[PDB]
């Protein structure tokens, strides 16, 4: 509400927003990548289109790799992402405990 308690409430709100934003960012990357995979998986495997199919497949593989690069540049590895989420969740839980105890110290007086 006021002072330190207000800072903690806002910290928690930011961390919840951080969790939500990162999930939406991951979803956006994964959608792009999944659509490229579907396109690859949809290529005709008839022998007569082999040259163009092969060339298209290699193009789409390239494009997928670039998106993976950009994703890693933004968010790190799958490991980095799971660690970050865990740290955020942990801080939120600590904050909630702090807020409860700090209110009680006030009320007591």
Curated annotation (Swiss-Prot):
It is linked to Familial adenomatous polyposis 1: An autosomal dominant cancer predisposition syndrome characterized by adenomatous polyps of the colon and rectum, but also of upper gastrointestinal tract (ampullary, duodenal and gastric adenomas). This is a viciously premalignant disease with one or more polyps progressing through dysplasia to malignancy in untreated gene carriers with a median age at diagnosis of 40 years. Desmoid disease, hereditary: An autosomal dominant disease characterized by multifocal fibromatosis of the abdominal wall and mesentery. Desmoid tumors can also affect paraspinal muscles, breast, occiput, arms, and lower ribs. Tumor suppressor. Promotes rapid degradation of CTNNB1 and participates in Wnt signaling as a negative regulator. APC activity is correlated with its phosphorylation state. Activates the GEF activity of SPATA13 and ARHGEF4. Plays a role in hepatocyte growth factor (HGF)-induced cell migration. Required for MMP9 up-regulation via the JNK signaling pathway in colorectal tumor cells. Associates with both microtubules and actin filaments, components of the cytoskeleton. Plays a role in mediating the organization of F-actin into ordered bundles. The microtubule tip localization signal (MtLS) motif; mediates interaction with MAPRE1 and targeting to the growing microtubule plus ends. The gene is APC. Forms homooligomers. Found in a complex consisting of ARHGEF4, APC and CTNNB1. Found in a complex composed of MACF1, APC, AXIN1, CTNNB1 and GSK3B. The complex composed, at least, of APC, CTNNB1 and GSK3B interacts with JPT1; the interaction requires the inactive form of GSK3B (phosphorylated at 'Ser-9'). Interacts with APC2. Interacts with DLG1 (via PDZ domains) and DLG3 (via PDZ domains). Interacts with alpha- and beta-catenins. Interacts with AXIN1 (via RGS domain). Interacts with ARHGEF4 (via N-terminus). This is Adenomatous polyposis coli protein. Phosphorylated; phosphorylation enhances the F-actin bundling activity. Phosphorylated by GSK3B. Ubiquitinated, leading to its degradation by the proteasome. Ubiquitination is facilitated by Axin. Deubiquitinated by ZRANB1/TRABID. APC mutations have led to some interesting observations. (1) the great majority of the mutations found to date would result in truncation of the APC product. (2) almost all the mutations have occurred within the first half of the coding sequence, and somatic mutations in colorectal tumors are further clustered in a particular region, called MCR (mutation cluster region). (3) most identified point mutations in the APC gene are transitions from cytosine to other nucleotides. (4) the location of germline mutations tends to correlate with the number of colorectal polyps in FAP1 patients. It is found in: Cell junction, Adherens junction; Cytoplasm, Cytoskeleton; Cell projection, Lamellipodium; Cell projection, Ruffle membrane. Expressed in a variety of tissues: brain, small intestine, colon, thymus, skeletal muscle, heart, prostate, lung, spleen, ovary, testis kidney, placenta, blood and liver. Isoform 1A: Very strongly expressed in brain but has relatively low expression levels in other tissues. Isoform 1B: Predominant form in all tissues except for brain, including gastric mucosa and blood. The chain holds residues 130 to 238 of 2843 of the full protein. Residues 1-109 form a coiled coil. Belongs to the adenomatous polyposis coli (APC) family. It comes from the Eukaryota.
